[PDB]
Amino acid sequence: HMLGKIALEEAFALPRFEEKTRWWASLFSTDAETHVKEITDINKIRIEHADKHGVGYQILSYTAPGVQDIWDPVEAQALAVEINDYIAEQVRVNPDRFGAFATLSMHNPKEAADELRRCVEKYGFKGALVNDTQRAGPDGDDMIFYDNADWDIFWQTCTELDVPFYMHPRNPTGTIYEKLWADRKWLVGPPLSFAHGVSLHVLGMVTNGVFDRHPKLQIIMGHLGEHVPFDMWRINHWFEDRKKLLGLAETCKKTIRDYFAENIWITTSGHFSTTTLNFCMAEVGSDRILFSIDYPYETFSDACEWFDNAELNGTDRLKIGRENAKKLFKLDSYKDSSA
Amino acid sequence: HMLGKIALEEAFALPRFEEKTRWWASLFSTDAETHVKEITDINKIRIEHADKHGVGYQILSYTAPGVQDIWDPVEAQALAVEINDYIAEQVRVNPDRFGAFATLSMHNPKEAADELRRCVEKYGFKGALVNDTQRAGPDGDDMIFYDNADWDIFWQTCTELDVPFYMHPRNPTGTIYEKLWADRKWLVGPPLSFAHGVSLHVLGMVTNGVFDRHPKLQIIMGHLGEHVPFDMWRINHWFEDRKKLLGLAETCKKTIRDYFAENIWITTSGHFSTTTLNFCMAEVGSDRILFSIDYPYETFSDACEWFDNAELNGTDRLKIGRENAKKLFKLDSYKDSSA
Amino acid sequence: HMLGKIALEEAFALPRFEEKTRWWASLFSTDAETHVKEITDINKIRIEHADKHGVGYQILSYTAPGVQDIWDPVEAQALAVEINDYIAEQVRVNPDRFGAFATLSMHNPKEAADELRRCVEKYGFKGALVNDTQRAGPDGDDMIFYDNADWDIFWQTCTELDVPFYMHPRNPTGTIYEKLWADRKWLVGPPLSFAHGVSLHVLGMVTNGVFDRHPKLQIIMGHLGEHVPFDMWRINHWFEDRKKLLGLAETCKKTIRDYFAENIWITTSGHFSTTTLNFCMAEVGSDRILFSIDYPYETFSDACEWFDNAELNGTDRLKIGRENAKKLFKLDSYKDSSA
Amino acid sequence: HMLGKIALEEAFALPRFEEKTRWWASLFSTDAETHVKEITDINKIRIEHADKHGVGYQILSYTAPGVQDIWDPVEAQALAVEINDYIAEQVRVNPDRFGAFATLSMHNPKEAADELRRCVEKYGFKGALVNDTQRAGPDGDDMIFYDNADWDIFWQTCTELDVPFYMHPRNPTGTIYEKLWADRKWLVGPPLSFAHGVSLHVLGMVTNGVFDRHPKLQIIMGHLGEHVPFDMWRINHWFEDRKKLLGLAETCKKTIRDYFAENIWITTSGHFSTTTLNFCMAEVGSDRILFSIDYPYETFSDACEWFDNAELNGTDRLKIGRENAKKLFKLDSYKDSSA
Ligand SMILES: [Mg+2]
Ligand SMILES: [Mg+2]
Ligand SMILES: [Mg+2]
Ligand SMILES: [Mg+2]
DSSP states (O other): OOOSEEEEEEEEOOGGGHHHHHHHHHHHOSOHHHHHHHHHOOSSHHHHHHHHTTEEEEEEEEOSSGGGGOOOHHHHHHHHHHHHHHHHHHHTTOTTTEEEOBOOOOSOHHHHHHHHHHHHHHHOOOOEEEESSEEESTTSOEEEOOOSGGGHHHHHHHHHHTOOEEEEOOOOOHHHIIIIIGGGGGGTTTTTHHHHHHHHHHHHHHHTTHHHHOTTOOEEESGGGTTGGGGHHHHHHHHHTTGGGTTGGGSOOSOHHHHHHHTEEEEOTTOOOHHHHHHHHHHTOGGGEEOOOOTTTSOHHHHHHHHHHSOOOHHHHHIIIIIHHHHHTTOOOOTTTTO | OOOSEEEEEEEEOOGGGHHHHHHHHHHHOSOHHHHHHHHHOOSSHHHHHHHHTTEEEEEEEEOSSGGGGOOSHHHHHHHHHHHHHHHHHHHTTOTTTEEEOBOOOOSSHHHHHHHHHHHHHHHOOOOEEEESSEEESTTSOEEEOOOSGGGHHHHHHHHHHTOOEEEEOOOOOHHHIIIIIGGGGGGTTTTTHHHHHHHHHHHHHHHTTHHHHOTTOOEEESGGGTTGGGGHHHHHHHHHTTGGGTTGGGSOOSOHHHHHHHTEEEEOTTOOOHHHHHHHHHHTOGGGEEOOOOTTTSOHHHHHHHHHHSOOOHHHHHIIIIIHHHHHTTOOOSTTTTO | OOOSEEEEEEEEOOGGGHHHHHHHHHHHOSOHHHHHHHHHOOSSHHHHHHHHTTEEEEEEEEOSSGGGGOOOHHHHHHHHHHHHHHHHHHTTSSTTTEEEOBOOOOSOHHHHHHHHHHIIIIIOOOOEEEESSEEESTTSOEEEOOOSGGGHHHHHHHHHHTOOEEEEOOOOOHHHIIIIIGGGGGGTTTTTHHHHHHHHHHHHHHHTTHHHHOTTOOEEESGGGTTGGGGHHHHHHHHHTTGGGTTGGGSOOSOHHHHHHHTEEEEOTTOOOHHHHHHHHHHTOGGGEEOOOOTTTSOHHHHHHHHHHSOOOHHHHHIIIIIHHHHHTTOOOOTTTTO | OOOSEEEEEEEEOOGGGHHHHHHHHHHHOSOHHHHHHHHHOOSSHHHHHHHHTTEEEEEEEEOSSGGGGOOOHHHHHHHHHHHHHHHHHHHTSSTTTEEEOBOOOOSOHHHHHHHHHHHHHHHOOOOEEEESSEEESTTSOEEEOOOSGGGHHHHHHHHHHTOOEEEEOOOOOHHHIIIIIGGGGGGTTTTTHHHHHHHHHHHHHHHTTHHHHOTTOOEEESGGGTTGGGGHHHHHHHHHTTGGGTTGGGTOOSOHHHHHHHTEEEEOTTOOOHHHHHHHHHHTOGGGEEOOOOTTTSOHHHHHHHHHHSOOOHHHHHIIIIIHHHHHTTOOOOTTTTO
16 A cells, blocks of 8 residues: 555575574474575565565665674674675666664674775765674673764764664673573564564663763664653653652753654664554654564565555654655655656 | 452562662662652552552562572571561551562572462462572573472462462672673663563563463563553564464463463553553553553652553443452452442 | 353344335345345354354344334334244243344323333343434424433332333434434434434433432443443543532433443444544443444444454453343343353 | 744734633633733833743734634724734834734635735735634634635735745634533643644545645644644554545645645644654645744743753754744844744
8 A cells, every 4th residue: 555665674584694584484484484585585585575565665784683793803894894885786687765873783882883984975874773782702702882972983974974873682691691591482582582672772872961962863763662652651750759759861962752852763664563553653753663574584465565565644654654765764766756 | 439449569678678678779869868758668658559549459578689680598587587577567567458469589499389378378478579589599581480390389389289489579780780780770660670570570481381281370560560551552563473483382371471371560650641542442452451550660659640540441440440359369359449 | 262242232023024124224235135135144253154153142222213213103012022922932942142232102101101011021022222312293293202200100110120121212203303404414414323323312311310319220321332431531521610519410420421331331333433432442341341332333343343353351352252241131141151 | 041032923903802802711811911011012021031032033823712702893803803903013012022913804815815915015914813613604603714715816916926824723602612622621731632623624625625726825833733743654544545536636635744845834822842843844844834933822931941951952943942943934134033
C-alpha cells in the first residue's frame, strides 16, 4: 500500500564469515540456510523483497556482533575498513535503493572518527551503526563505552559531518554472560538482553552529558527504543525529582523528554505492535519514530504487512514510513520517494 | 476520593540499621531526616498519610537491599527471623490497617520455605517479598537465582500456602556494579538498574519452567512490570515464532501472555502515569494490576493524588484500587474496605 | 485461535419479506444475492461460518428496521408474535448453538412487557433487541421513545426477568430524514445516523432517570457504544460540573461513568478496530465489552479474523470473546464454551 | 509552564444583547453574572486569564448561536457586518494578543463570500467561524447547509484567501428540537446535540464532494472532532468497503483518512482528556490537532492546567499548543510566541 518506505536497521555480512554467520543464525533464526543467503545477498533477494513490499530505500549496516566482537584493535580496525570498502562497492549496483552506515572499530575515538569521516567523505555513507560496547582486553572481557570525555572527539565528528549514530545491540559475553545469562540462555538477544545493553549505553550518554556537549548529535535506537519509552514517566520523575537534587544535574542539563525531542530517535525494527507504536507516539512523538525491519532477523512480510495495514492516521504513516528519514538523512530522490 | 485502597510495596527498616538506612537514603532520598523517620515509623506517620489519602490497608515489607544483601547464611537467616518477629509485633497495634509480607534469607530453598511457612501459619503474613537475587559467596560477589529445580520445594510451599511472592529489586553490587554501572551511576535504582534485575529474574522463571511445574504460583512485579509489558509483543514474537522452534518449548509450555494471565501481577508502585497504565491495561489487563505506592521512596501524596484523580473507568479504578488485592490476598474486611 | 466465542448482534429476516430485505440490502450490502440467502438462513450457512471461525453460540435477533418500522400497532404486534414463534422453532434445530432475543412491538409498554415475558418464560429467550424508537402516528412520522415513566412497567419486567435490552439502531424516517439526511444520504446507517439515534435514546434513559428507577437494568449498545465512549470525559464534565447544578440532578442521580459500570454494555459489532477497542477499555472497561459481529451486514471473516488475531492480553480476550456474555446471559454450556 | 499558547474557539458577544446572553447563560453557565461580564469583555478580564495561564494569542469569534440564529437575511447580514466592524476595533487595543474570525450571515453564498473577503482584506481576519446551519424560512424552521454546489463560490473564496473555516455548533431549534430533544433537554449542547450537528455537516461536506472540488479547503472542528475520530475505522470501512460500491464514489473521491490528513483539523476545546487526546493522536495525528479552550463556557484554568501538565512528549505539546496554529494561520510574532 504505502510505497517508497525507508528501512535502516538492515544487516549484511561478509561472504568470508560464513561460519560466524551460521553460528549467530543458530541462535536467532529458524531457517539458518535462508538466513545465510539473505544476510549475504545485497542486490537480488533483498531487492525482490523490497519490490514486493513498497520499500524504496534501505540504509545497510553490518550484522551484530560485528566489529564490536573483535578485541584485537589491529584486527578490528582492518575489518571495519574492509567492510566499508566492500559495502560501498555493493551499493553501487543500486544507489537509488541502497545507502550504508559506517562500520567502525570503537577501540580508539580518533581512529573511529577518521574512519567515519572516510566513509562519509569517500563513499557518502549516511552515519554509523555500532553494536553497543566494543569488546576489549585480554579475552575480550572488557567493554568500551562511549559516554565519556574521551569520546568527545568522535561525537564532535558526528555533528560536524551531521550524520546520526545508530546504537544497535550485541550479545552478552564473558563474565556478564556467565553471571546473568547462561542459566536463562533463552533470554539472550531480542527477548531481553539486547534492550538491556542499548538502554544502558544510551541513558549513560544522557546522564554523562554527551547531548549537552553535543546538542546536535542524533542517536537512533531500534526496537521502539529498547524499553526506554515505557519508563519515560518514571525516569523523568527519578531524574527531575530525585537524582538531580543529589548530583546528576552537574552532568545532565536537560530532561529525558528534552533529549527525546532533540537528540534521540526510535525505529520500529522487530516490534510490529500498533498498540506499542501508539504508546510511543504519546511518549516520544511520531516525528521521532522511523520505520525499520531488522532484516533478515525479521521478514519483509512481517514488518511491511504490519505497517502497511496498521490502523494509523495518514499523516503519521507517511512520516514514520519515509518522510522523517528523508529529512533526517537529507535524502535525494529514490525509488517511489514521492509515490 | 476513592477510599479503602490497598498498597503493597511499602517498606520499613529496623531502628538498629540507621547507618545503612542513611547510606541508602543518600542514594534515593532528597530529605534524609524525613526518610529515616518515615521508613522506621509504622503506627503514627504511616497511618496519618494513609488517613489523608484514602489508603485503608497496607501490606508492609522490609526495605531493600535487606536480607538479600547479607552473604553469610547464618547472619542472613537470623536477620530474617528477627525482622519477621519484629514486624508481626508492630502490626498487631493496627490489624485493620496493616498486614505483612515475609522477609526471607534465600540462601537455602528448604530454609526459606520453612520460614515462609512459619510467617504464614503463625503470624498470618500475606506472602513473601524478596529483593531479587540473594548475595552469596565469600565476599558476597555471587548471586543466587530462584529459577531452577532446587527451588521447587520453595515454590511448592508458596502454592500450598496459596500466597504470592513479590519480586522486588535491589542494587547492583560487586563485579556487575563495577563493569556496568559505576561509570553511569545515576542510572542505579529506579531509572534503570532495578527493572533490569527483576525482569531478568522473572523471565528466567518463565523460561526455566517454574510456572509449568507450579501453575498456581503468583509472582508480583512493581513499577508497572519492570519494562516487560512494553515488550509483550516482541517477547511473545521471539518466543512463539523463534526460540520455541529451537528448544525453548521443552522447558516453557505456555505463551508469555498466558503467564501474565495466570501467574504474574504488576503494581503501580513508583510509576504514576495514566498513559502507561492504559498501555498496561491493554498489554496485561486491569484484572492483573494492583495499586501500590513504594513508600517512603515515593510519597502518599504523589501516588494517591495521581490515582484518585486519574481518568479511568469506574470498574477498573475499583479493581486496581482495592478489589483485585482483596481477592488475591483474601482480604474481606479492613478500614473503608466497602467505602 | 479462540474458540467458543459468543456473538449477539446477529440478524435474521422472515423469508416472506424478500422485497423489504432486498431494499435494505440495496443500502447496506455489496452482494444482495448472498445477503438475502444469509439473512434468511438460520441453520446451515450461519453454522458453517461459526464453525470456521470459533463462534460457539449466537444470540439471534430480527433485522432492522423490523417491527419498529410498523406504525399500525395491530400489525406491529402480530408481526412481533409471528417473528418470536418463528425463531423459537428455528433454533430448536441447533439449540446448543443458538439463542434468541425477543422482537417487540413498542407501541404500548404493557403489551411489550407481556410479549417479552412470553418469550423468556415460554421460549427461554435471552432478552430483547429493539431498533431504537417505534414509528407511530397516522403516517408513521411520530417516534415513541422509552425514556419516561410510561415505560416503568416495561423496564421493571426486564429487571424482574433479569434479562438485558439491546438498543439497536434504525434508519431515519419522515420529517427527520427530510430535514437532516436527505441531502447527505450516504451518511444514513453505519457512517453516522445509526449512532446518532442510539446515543440519543440511551443518554435520554440516563438523564430521565431510567437507571435510577431501575438500577439493575442492563442496556447493550453495539458499534463500541455509538460514539458515547469518545465523549465520556466531556459528558461527565458537562453533567457533573454544569447541567447537574442547573436541574439535571433532579432526574439523574449517578455519574455517566457509574451508569457504564452498573447498567450499560457495549459490543464490538461493526467496529473491528483494536485502537478504538483499547480506548474503550480505558473509558468503559473490558468487563463491560462484548464480542459481536453484526452479521450479515459484516462478515464472520472480518469480525473473527480481527478479534482472533488482535493484539490483546489473554484475560480480556477471554472476557470479551465469551466470558462476559456467559455471565451476563447466565448461559449453560454450549459448543467449545470452555475450550 | 508552556508559554505562547494559541486558542481559537474563544467567544464574545455584543453588550446590547444582554437579554439573549442571559438566556444562553441560563442553559450553559453555573455563574451567570461572571459569564455576562466575561463574554462581553475583550481587553481586561480575558487578558488577565491569558497572562496567568501562558496563552499568548487568541483568535476571537462570535458566540453561538450568533448570526445563524437570525432567519431574516437583511437583519442577519447587518448584524454580521456590525459584529465584524466591532471586533476589528476591539482587537486594535491589544493587536499582539488577539486576532479574529469573520462572523457571517450564511443565507446567501456570494454575500457571505464578499463579507469574508472584506474581513480578511480590510481587517486581516484569520478565517471564518460559523455556528453550523443558518436558520431560514418564514419562522426560522428551515436550515441552510453548505455542503452543495451553490456554495462553491464561497468555498473558492476560502481557498483563494487561503484561510480556514471553523464549523462551530449551535443549539437545535424548532421542529428538530421538539421531535428529538425537548423530552431529553439536558442533552442539548455539549453533552450530545452540538456534536451531532457539526459531525453531520462536516461529513456532509466530505460525502458531497466539497473537498474534492476545493482540495485546499481547511475546515476546523472543536471538541476533539465531534465524535468523528471515534468512528474513523467504522466510517472508513462503510465508505470504502460498502457505500463506494453503491454510488458514493461518484461524489467522494478520497478516503475519510485522506480528508483528515489534507483538509480537516480538530481542536481540544471543551475536551480536556489526555486519554482521548492520545486516541486522537492515533486516529488523526498530532499535526492536525490544535489547542483551544471554548472560553468562557470553559475556564482558562481547566483548559490550561490540563494541557500544561498533561503527560505528553515535548514535540507534540509544542505543536498542539502553538506551532500547528502558527503555521496554519501564518502568524507573525505575538507575546511569548517563541518562549
Ligand atoms: Mg538488528
Ligand atoms: Mg520498593
Ligand atoms: Mg446490527
Ligand atoms: Mg465553543
